């Protein structure tokens with residue numbers, strides 16, 4: 466049987482791709498197992514690696530602030546993870562073989578949580594989830610800021626791509642766009658399906 470607990474244990478000791486050799490801590494993700502909103506980023510950065518926790522550096526602090534101020538939620542009420550769960554070396558993005566190796570953990574996490582909404586933060590997570598959906602992916606610029614319905618198992622999941630929070634740290638305009646995207650996510654979260 467599968468569980469978020471089992472996945473967490475596996476990730477923490479995982480050596481299924483070459484990223485394990487560099488890490489201090491793998492980062493399985495954290496949050497409410499019955500979260501209505503699931504956030505998926507790219508991969509851990511430096512502070513995430515040090516702490517074993519997703520989105521805790523500057524970009525993460527911005528994410529937390531938007532979740533709190535715009536969605537009206539604490540981190541413990543949502544679920545937050547990444548498509549790749551170890552920090553790639555040298556500030557680089559995950560290789561495709563690393564996404565291929567690690568993404569079954571995310572698949573398993575989604576299978577268990579079955580959130581109402583998945584917010585895909587940035588191009589890597591958006592491209593990955595679009596591939597599972599069978600939704601055409603052009604670029605994050607072209608696809609962000611609206612919802613995509615993912616018929617999955619017995620339910621529908623609303624997928625909402627946004628820019629990654631890191632992109633909003635030093636760009637006032639991009640930040641405003643991300644905030645507006647989170648306002649739209651709030652409306653989707655509080656509105657009953659009809």
Ligand SMILES: O=c1cc[nH]c(=O)[nH]1
Nearest residue numbers: 506507508510519520
């Ligand atoms: O957890 C993290 C931290 C930074 N960037 C991400 O994509 N995820």
Ligand code: SF4
Nearest residue numbers: 479482485550551567
């Ligand atoms: S990135 Fe994923 S697949 Fe690779 S070692 Fe870490 S947990 Fe395992």
